[PDB]
Design a protein around this ligand. Structure first.
Ligand code: SF4
Ligand code: SF4
Ligand code: SF4
Ligand code: SF4
Ligand code: SF4
Ligand code: SF4
Ligand code: FES
Lengths: 370, 191, 127, 737, 144, 154
């Protein structure tokens, strides 16, 4: 019985109630991993956001980080900040949807009518600073493209003044609600609980293994409370609604330490000369002219860095070969591995429940088929 | 992070250790002693949150042992009990005409082991099923497989074949200026 | 300084001369290059007279026999100069309030210029 | 050999090696700017600086390009001091530049740029430039050659160009003027007289000195590079043809040490104006007493229906001079199967070049003397540049890990030329007569007497004697001849000469001739030759002399353009490709096998000759194993023909004398007639040496008309006949009034 | 007979009709799939392709097209569908029009929802035929 | 809401626009950079020599042919970015879906700032004989796009 879910993926399940589920993906395979092997490290930035396309910024970042370290660039204090405010602002964006699809299958339509408003509100914020609804070409190797507009902070305040509580109302809905058929047998328990199905159920699993708390790699100093719990399909839902909570305390927290200054590493071999002086520039004209035609050349080597648990552990494994284009780029891509859990996840339970069983893993095809 | 230390510790006998300036250190293992050794790494068996990648060194500036190579990433999950964070890679160069490599599916890296056969060559021996998460004919990731691109089209019969239009340079390419590369033969900032 | 303003205002004139003298004597006048200070100007300001920074009076084959050029608005020790190719002769013109455009203490009048352009054209013209 | 430790890498390198080359050999780098392959390394442009020692550190940095290496030497190129140094030099080099990059035609293929971005800025906020003063302003974009070469007198001061001029062609037509921060590039020999002027374009590490033949067309990377061989003459140099969107933008020289060095004559470099433009794209066919387009299907039928009246009755095959090695073979085999034949090249010499054993350019340099009988400068242009090095007692350099050397101390700036190493004999005060002490001007078609004397069987002019006495003293000399190869009477003894000594350089009027001869595309016995009509039903891959179209019944011309003669005497026309867009092999005048690759040029995508021969072969009967390339190769590999870069040995002792008489001499030339377009307009259309006086109603520099068996053409002061491809015969008089 | 005022004014009256009986049957793939959902503020014809048409996906969209009522249309949402996107590769189709005839291409990536609206409007104004548009030519209402 | 204009934020990535200086010159000097930085290879450029008399751009070079294949474009600022003159900037228009493929490649005439609607908008509006009412509005025109006419009411 071959079926097409409701998220561009094929799943074959011989089972009369639930047996072996053979998922066939590759329907959105775009070859990213290879096409990037034919683009500027700068050009690649436009490619990174088209894989998770929800919490894109996670990729943007994770990729920059690899390269930044690779060629020893250093991010300005005020950038690091933007890069989390931005990153976590998107983390919310990703979850606002997971929570969205959780609302319909349930019934709460009045609330759903809000969720996809908070969303549009966040997205509006993006178009404010980056000029694009998404795939914002903002993160730059040295930091970010350009300083954020005067209208970003205030508006972020209007959305940061309501959500504080408007998360509990979403918790006060999936928790204390009578629709308890949420405690499905979907037990992502290869070894344990949900705290990992919250992060990266790769097989062996965990409870508080948040790659951005442990193996802390980028800006982090946040006293940021990770939400990992027990149970299994009821929590997968609850948990992520939980992450939204303090994920905002992060936005607030980091919105505090926002003092003006430089937004990207000035090191000329890594960044273009302020386009302000080409009317004099040594021949920084040369730099500019070169910087955009043939890019910079990171040292021969091989790096990788596990990025924020943006819907799961993530990281780019770039192989520089002293050229203007990466020699090889492998994206970890969480979903693609989280999807291995699914066969078991919904191994022994009623088919009718096998929908939320999957949506509970919050897989994104562009992320898996990449 | 003990575990990690104990790793190299003993493996400091016959195995080479490649370390990069950034916190990404990893160990190479010969062909043979991989199966058992990789298994041995089940010693306090890094929880095995293993992630993996398939590299093809053909068309690389500096020559390496064998054309294809594989990397794995064994890690001791920190939120468990004996999880401290011990993370490190491990690689194994694989023969061009003998693309084999015992699976490690012994929750795991089902997909990975597959992925590679999929895109690159690989072709692990033992394995539940060598499913294919790509499409059909040949192998793509391999550097000698055309990226297969169509010229972008414009009006009056003007077309741009990307291959020839790229300004960027592939580490192996000599550049547009005679035979030369300088502080653009790679570049890492000091400190 | 207001001195800068005048200099350029002068450069425009000096140019006007060169054009006058070229069309008049049947010799070719040519704009050699415009200010990068302007080509790459972008949404930035610019209230300066012309874009022309280096002009010349060339002969039949082209070889120039008189080069005039003023320094860009972003340079220091501003000055407008005259140079006779092939014959080691360089002239630096500064601006002075009242006395006007001088080449030191001696004024650079339309007449003088022409006389200079003339002598120069006379001797250095290949065609 | 010496042992030099560069940095952490040790290397064995010959004794006369340059620290520079040492470095690059070791696999390192240093700002290259004034130095250049094949030019005299000099100190200017203090860039290739380095620190040396023996260990003791030399007090001051050295010019890695003019500094010789020594046993046990240590050359560091990364010391904080060295970089701070390079860094500074660039700063200076850039200090007075103008800021034209986006605007500049040197695109990302600029040396100043790469080195700037390379070693450029040095740091231990960032300061891009500290010079806030008025930059140098001079003359910009004033075209030296109304033809090519447009320079921006706003260059760095390397010497590559003037240096080049005085060293390679030997025609100093550019030098510096005035001095100090004012020195610039001016001239006084306005049209840039010499051939070989183009090369300065390829060498100039910056924006002044640019190829105007292709100014403002596309940016350097945008171009689609297609490397192949120029087939306008026998030397088959090496090139790269930049094309973009089906049109041909410019030509560059491709380095090939063995044959063409890295130079390119101007005719070949700027003579591309034509393929670019006006060309035939659809086969035309004569219907209704006029020519009208058709389809290959049509043309074919109308083709067969013109040969179905007479089958296998002396069919004629005549290929163009630039016919590939395959196209030749095919044409051959087809004439074999077709028992009634007699084929030929667009310029096959009465005396087969396969007579004289192929001599190499490599050899030429190592020869001991050069007896020449035909202005190489027009015959095989590059031979001039080679002799340039010959007269300088220069021997082929040592190859390093990076091929040909950047700083070859072997070459000194302004070296003295030996006039006692060469003897020139040609119908006019030839250019290379300058480096010839033994040099005499004679009369058209009278080269025999000279060689005769040279054999020792007769008397001759003093010089011929000094030449004899010369040729006699020489151990391993080389004979160079090219025009009088069409007067077997002479060529016969030319051979005899060599034998008794000895290799030769045959400057054939037809390129790849040496190759077609190896294919047997010759008439042999009875029959008519390329300019000799008579046969019936023929295939012309080029426009023959009018007298050859007349009389024939059916004629198919496989032209690539539309010559009038075709639209008035031809029955079927078939659009062909230029050598620039053909795939296939070639046989150099030194018997070398040079390749030919296709360029994305826009032709009426109307097939090559491989298809046509094969096609027209259908109308006749059999279908020889030739159709496509990949399969036609086995055909060549069959006859055991060296493949790439290989040298093919194949003698031939047979000659078909057809001696001609007349008052006109088609003087061999560099440029070919079908090049008179665009900027080549005036460098192609047709002075006190041979006797045939002025008083014939021919004024000084007046535009007249002239008719010879090879057609009608206009000229001026025309000493004899300026010409195109494949001809150096004497012919019929006719200056129509 | 065909071009008579009778038959003409009829079909033209019909088309104006079928002009508003258009039933958007979205067939989204990647990122586009999400940005086209913001236009849903309240058999099948007029299928909208919004996303990267993988080659593995290719044959499928086809079968889903063939299985529609002849009077149908195709709108290509954003790059990927329209042109080979920014992905020239073995993985993706260069132009959805290579399988299912396209009537209106929409230049986004992802195009604001509104972009999509104006998009069908053009489809709308075409099915009518009241919209012949470039070289000055009369545009057919269907695709085939 | 196709009757009530869309209010998008300035900085929004829209139809490309080529700007001019007050003097009236095209800022753009035919340097194929923007084209080079394009990741989808959606720009083709042909340069020409400025006619000494009756010039086009400031420098000695101007863009004879400047085309962008709007379908291949991904609307990713990079080009506007790479430009060394500030010529190409990103307009606000977006109502530009069309019919024939090859008619989605905007030319120079289709992009200068003196222009108003989009290829498809001006088109129908040609026979319509009724002006182009653009479906958007911004708080103000970006500094960079100075000279671009639009519903600034914002
Ligand atoms: S010569 Fe080189 S550095 Fe100078 S303007 Fe041209 S490209 Fe730029
Ligand atoms: S014109 Fe070019 S080659 Fe000649 S000196 Fe100047 S930079 Fe060197
Ligand atoms: S010498 Fe001969 S082969 Fe070389 S460029 Fe000139 S014509 Fe071509
Ligand atoms: S066009 Fe853009 S938004 Fe749409 S699927 Fe392609 S990459 Fe994603
Ligand atoms: S926005 Fe991006 S895709 Fe569009 S033209 Fe510019 S660089 Fe190319
Ligand atoms: S738009 Fe800008 S980048 Fe593009 S060619 Fe014009 S000046 Fe150059
Ligand atoms: S100093 Fe010029 S290259 Fe050596």
């Amino acid at each position: 019985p071959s079926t097409h879910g409701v998220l561009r993926l094929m799943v074959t399940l011989s089972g009369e109630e639930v047996l072996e589920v053979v998922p066939h993906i590759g329907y959105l395979h775009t070859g990213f991993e290879k096409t990037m092997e034919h683009r500027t490290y700068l050009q690649n930035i436009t490619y990174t956001p088209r894989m998770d396309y929800l919490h894109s910024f996670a990729h943007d970042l994770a990729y920059a980080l690899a390269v930044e370290k690779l060629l020893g660039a250093v991010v300005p204090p005020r950038a690091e900040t933007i890069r989390v405010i931005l990153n976590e602002l998107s983390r919310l964006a990703s979850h606002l949807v997971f929570l969205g699809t959780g609302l319909l299958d349930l019934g709460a339509l009045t609330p759903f009518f809000y969720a996809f408003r908070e969303r549009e509100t966040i997205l509006d914020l993006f178009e404010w600073v980056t000029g694009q609804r998404f795939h914002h070409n903002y993160i730059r190797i040295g930091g970010v493209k350009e300083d954020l507009p005067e209208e970003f902070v205030p508006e972020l305040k209007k959305l940061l003044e309501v959500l504080p509580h408007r998360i509990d109302e979403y918790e006060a809905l999936f928790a204390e609600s009578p629709i308890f058929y949420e405690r499905a047998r979907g037990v992502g328990v290869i070894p344990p609980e949900v705290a990992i199905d919250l992060g990266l159920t790769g097989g062996s699993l965990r409870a508080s293994g948040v790659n951005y708390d442990v193996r802390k790699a980028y800006p982090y100093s946040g006293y940021d409370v990770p939400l990992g719990e027990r149970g299994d399909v009821f929590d997968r839902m609850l948990v992520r609604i939980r992450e939204m909570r303090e994920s905002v305390k992060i936005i607030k927290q980091a919105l505090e330490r926002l003092e003006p200054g430089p937004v990207r590493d000035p090191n000329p071999q890594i960044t273009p000369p302020p386009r302000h002086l080409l009317e004099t520039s040594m021949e920084a004209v040369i730099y500019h002219f070169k910087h955009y035609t043939e890019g910079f050349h990171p040292p021969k080597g091989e790096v990788y860095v596990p990025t924020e648990s943006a819907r799961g552990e993530l990281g780019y494994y770039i192989v520089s070969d002293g050229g203007s284009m990466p020699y090889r780029v492998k994206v970890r891509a969480p979903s693609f591995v989280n999807l291995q859990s699914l066969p078991y996840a919904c191994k022994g339970e009623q088919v009718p429940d096998m929908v939320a069983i999957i949506a509970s893993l919050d897989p994104v095809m562009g992320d898996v088929d990449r | 992070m003990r575990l990690e230390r104990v790793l190299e510790e003993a493996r400091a006998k016959g195995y080479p250790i490649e370390d990069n300036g950034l916190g990404n250190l990893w160990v190479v293992l010969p062909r043979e002693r991989f199966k058992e050794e990789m298994a041995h790494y089940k010693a306090m068996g890094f929880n095995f949150l293993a992630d993996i990648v398939g590299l093809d060194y053909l068309t690389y500036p500096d020559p390496r042992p064998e054309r294809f190579a594989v990397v794995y990433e064994l890690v001791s999950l920190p939120g468990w009990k004996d999880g401290d964070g011990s993370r490190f890679f491990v690689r194994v160069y694989v023969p061009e005409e003998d693309p084999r490599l015992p699976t490690v599916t012994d929750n795991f890296l089902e997909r990975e082991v597959y992925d590679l056969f999929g895109i690159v060559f690989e072709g692990h021996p033992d394995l539940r099923k060598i499913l294919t998460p790509e499409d059909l004919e040949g192998h793509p990731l391999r550097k000698d497989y055309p990226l297969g691109e169509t010229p972008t089209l414009f009006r009056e019969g003007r077309y741009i074949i990307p291959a020839e239009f790229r300004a960027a340079l592939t580490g192996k390419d000599p550049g547009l200026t005679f035979y030369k590369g300088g502080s653009r033969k790679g570049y890492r900032s000091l400190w | 300084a207001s001195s800068e303003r005048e200099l350029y205002e002068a450069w425009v004139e000096l140019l006007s001369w060169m054009r006058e003298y070229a069309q008049a004597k049947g010799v070719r006048f040519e704009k050699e290059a415009d200010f990068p200070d302007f080509i790459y100007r972008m949404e930035r300001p610019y209230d300066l007279p012309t874009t022309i920074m280096t002009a010349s009076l060339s002969d039949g084959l082209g070889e120039p026999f008189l080069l005039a050029d003023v320094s860009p608005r972003h340079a220091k020790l501003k000055r407008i100069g005259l140079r006779l190719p092939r014959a080691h002769i360089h002239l630096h013109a500064h601006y002075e309030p009242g006395k006007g455009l001088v080449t030191g203490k001696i004024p650079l009048t339309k007449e003088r210029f022409f006389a200079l352009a003339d002598r120069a054209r006379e001797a250095l013209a290949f065609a | 050999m010496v042992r030099v430790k560069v940095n952490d890498r040790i290397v064995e390198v010959p004794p006369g090696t340059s620290v520079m080359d040492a470095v690059f050999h070791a696999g390192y780098d240093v700002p290259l700017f004034c130095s250049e392959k094949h030019l005299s390394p000099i100190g200017a442009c203090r860039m290739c600086l380095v620190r040396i020692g023996l260990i003791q550190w030399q007090p001051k940095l050295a010019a890695s390009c003019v500094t010789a290496v020594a046993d046990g030497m240590v050359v560091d190129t990364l010391s904080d001091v060295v970089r701070e140094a390079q860094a500074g030099m660039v700063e200076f080099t850039l200090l007075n530049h103008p800021l034209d990059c986006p605007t500049c035609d040197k695109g990302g293929a600029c040396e100043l740029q790469d080195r700037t971005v390379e070693y450029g800025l040095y740091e231990k906020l960032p300061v891009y430039t500290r010079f806030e003063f008025t930059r140098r302003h001079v003359d910009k974009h004033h075209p030296l050659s109304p033809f090519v070469i447009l320079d921006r007198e706003r260059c760095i001061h390397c010497k590559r160009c003037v240096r080049y001029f005085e060293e390679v062609p030997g025609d100093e037509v550019l030098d510096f003027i005035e001095r100090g921060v004012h020195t610039f590039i001016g001239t006084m020999d306005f049209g840039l007289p010499s051939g070989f002027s183009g090369n300065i374009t390829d060498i100039c590490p910056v924006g002044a000195l640019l190829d105007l033949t292709a100014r403002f067309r596309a940016r350097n990377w945008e171009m689609e590079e297609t490397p192949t061989t120029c087939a306008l003459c026998p030397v088959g140099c090496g090139i790269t043809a930049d094309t973009r969107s089906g049109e041909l933008l410019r030509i560059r020289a491709r380095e090939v040490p063995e044959v063409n060095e890295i130079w390119i004559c101007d005719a070949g470099r700027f003579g591309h104006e034509w393929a670019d433009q006006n060309r035939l794209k659809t086969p035309l066919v004569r219907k209704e007493g006029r020519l009208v387009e058709a389809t290959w299907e049509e043309a074919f039928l109308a083709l067969k229906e013109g040969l179905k009246e007479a089958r296998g009755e002396e069919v004629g095959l005549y290929l163009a001079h630039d016919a590939t090695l395959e196209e030749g073979l095919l044409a051959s085999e087809l004439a074999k199967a077709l028992k009634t034949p007699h084929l030929d090249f667009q310029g096959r010499t009465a005396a087969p070049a396969s007579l004289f054993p192929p001599a190499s350019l490599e050899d030429l340099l190592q020869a001991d003397f050069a007896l020449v009988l035909g202005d190489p400068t027009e015959e095989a242009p590059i031979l001039h540049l080679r002799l340039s090095e010959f007269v300088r007692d220069l021997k082929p350099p040592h190859r390093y890990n990076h091929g040909t050397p950047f700083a070859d101390l072997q070459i000194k700036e302004r070296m003295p030329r030996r006039t006692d190493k060469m003897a020139l004999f040609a119908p006019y005060r030839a250019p290379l007569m300058k480096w010839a002490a033994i040099h005499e001007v004679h009369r058209p078609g009278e080269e025999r007497e000279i060689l005769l004397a040279l054999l020792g069987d007769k008397e001759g002019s003093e010089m011929v004697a000094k030449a004899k006495e010369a040729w006699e003293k020489a151990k391993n000399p080389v004979l160079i001849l090219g025009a009088g190869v069409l007067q077997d009477t002479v060529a016969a003894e030319r051979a005899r000469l060599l034998a008794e000594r000895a290799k030769v350089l045959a400057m054939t009027p037809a390129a790849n001739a040496r190759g077609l001869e190896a294919m047997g595309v010759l008439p042999g016995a009875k029959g008519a030759s390329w300019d000799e009509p008579g046969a019936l039903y023929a295939y012309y891959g080029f426009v023959p002399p009018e007298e050859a179209l007349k009389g024939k019944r059916f004629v198919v011309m496989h032209l690539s353009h539309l010559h009038p003669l075709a639209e008035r005497y031809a029955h079927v026309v078939l659009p062909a490709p230029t050598f620039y867009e053909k795939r296939g092999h070639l046989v150099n005048l030194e018997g070398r096998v040079l390749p030919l690759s296709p360029a994305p040029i826009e032709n009426g995508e109307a097939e090559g000759a491989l298809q046509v021969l094969a096609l027209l072969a259908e109308a006749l009967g059999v279908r020889p194993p030739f159709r496509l390339h990949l399969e036609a190769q086995k055909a060549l590999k069959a006859r055991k023909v060296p493949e790439a870069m290989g040298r093919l040995s194949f003698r031939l002792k047979e000659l078909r004398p057809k001696e001609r008489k007349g008052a006109f001499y088609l003087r061999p030339t560099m440029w070919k007639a079908h090049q008179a377009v665009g900027k080549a307009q005036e460098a192609a259309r047709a002075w006190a040496h041979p006797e045939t006086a002025r008083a014939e109603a021919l004024p000084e520099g007046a535009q007249v008309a002239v008719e010879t068996p090879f057609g009608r053409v206009e000229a001026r002061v025309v000493h004899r006949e300026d010409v195109p491809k494949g001809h150096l015969y004497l012919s019929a008089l006719g200056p129509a009034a | 007979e065909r071009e008579g005022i009778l038959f003409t004014t009829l079909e033209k009256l019909v088309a104006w009709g079928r002009s508003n009986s258009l039933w958007p049957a979205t067939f989204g793939l990647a990122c586009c799939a999400i940005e086209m959902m913001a236009s849903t503020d309240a058999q099948a014809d007029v299928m909208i392709v919004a996303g990267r048409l993988s080659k593995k996906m290719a044959p499928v969209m086809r079968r889903v097209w063939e299985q529609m009522p002849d009077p149908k249309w195709v709108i290509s949402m954003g790059a990927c569908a329209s042109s080979g996107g920014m992905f020239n590769n073995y993985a993706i189709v260069q132009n959805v029009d290579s399988v299912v005839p396209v009537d209106v291409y929409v230049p986004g990536c992802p195009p604001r929802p509104e972009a999509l609206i104006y998009a069908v409007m053009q489809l709308q104004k075409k099915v009518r035929g009241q919209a012949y548009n470039e070289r000055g030519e009369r545009l057919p209402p269907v695709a085939a | 809401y196709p009757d009530a204009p869309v209010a998008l934020k300035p900085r929004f990535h829209g139809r490309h626009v080529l700007t001019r200086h007050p003097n009236g010159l095209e800022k753009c000097i035919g340097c194929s950079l923007c084209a080079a930085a394009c990741p989808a290879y959606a720009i083709y450029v042909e340069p020409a020599e400025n006619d000494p008399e009756n010039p086009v751009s400031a420098g000695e070079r101007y863009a004879k042919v400047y085309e962008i294949n709007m379908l291949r474009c991904i609307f990713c600022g990079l080009c506007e970015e790479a430009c060394p003159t500030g010529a190409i900037v990103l307009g606000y228009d977006f109502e530009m879906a069309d019919y024939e493929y090859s008619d989605l490649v905007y030319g120079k005439e289709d992009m200068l700032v003196d222009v108003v609607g989009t290829k498809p908008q001006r088109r129908e509006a040609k026979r319509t004989g009724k002006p182009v009412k653009v479906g958007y509005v911004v708080p103000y025109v970006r500094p960079e796009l100075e000279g671009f006419k639009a519903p600034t009411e914002g």
